[PDB]
Amino acid sequence: MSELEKAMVALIDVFHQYSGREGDKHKLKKSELKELINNELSHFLEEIKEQEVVDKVMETLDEDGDGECDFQEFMAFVSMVTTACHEFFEHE
Amino acid sequence: MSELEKAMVALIDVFHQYSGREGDKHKLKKSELKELINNELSHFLEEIKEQEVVDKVMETLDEDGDGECDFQEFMAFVSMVTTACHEFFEHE
Structure with a gap:
């Protein structure tokens, strides 16, 4: 019943889902x-x-x-890119 | 309407909330x-x-x-610690 839990913990779910798609269940592509x-x-x-943040992870990608x-x-x-854009709390 | 969005994006909210508590609105403690x-x-x-992951961020903390x-x-x-424990997809 918290923000970091329902959210952060939800991320751990994406890996069990997207990665749970094919046989592998602990490695993405x-x-x-x-x-x-x-x-x-x-x-x-x-x-x-x-x-540099998005070009750094997007580069190795x-x-x-x-x-x-x-x-x-x-x-x-996923954290570096979600924090790349400077404006992250201003959505007017 | 996706997992990484509602979840990852929710994290950006925590900073606007927890940090939005006091005057500062872009720096935590x-x-x-x-x-x-x-x-x-x-x-x-x-x-x-x-x-080492939790002792590394918890150490600088x-x-x-x-x-x-x-x-x-x-x-x-927050990502390093949520990934420290090896068992993250097995909660029996």
Whole structure:
């Protein structure tokens, strides 16, 4: 019944879901990760002030596009992008 | 209407709330951060296999206990701890 719990804990669910799709149940794919952000989230993205944060995770993302991601990797990857844009509390 | 959106985006809300408590509205406090994790989350914690992940963020947390945290800092800090415990998809 809290914010970080229902929300943060909900993230742990996405991995059990998206990753629970195919046989694997503890490893994602650089493509399902880049898609996880530009698909599930993709909404408050406008100019992206942290071009280095999104270009850093998006770079390693398009750099391999041939391996799989982990749970701590797709986790620290979804947070950096959700914090890239400077305006995150102002949606007028 | 997605998992990463309602969840991940919900996190951006916690900062606008917990931090929106006092005058500041874009900076948390090492104490409200450590409390943000052990207060809002605190639930699926059992043995914590990543004693280094929780001891790493919990160390810098109890190391300063005198400054304030940012939004990308409290963000990458809440993800590392929610991924510290190895068992995150098995709650029997």
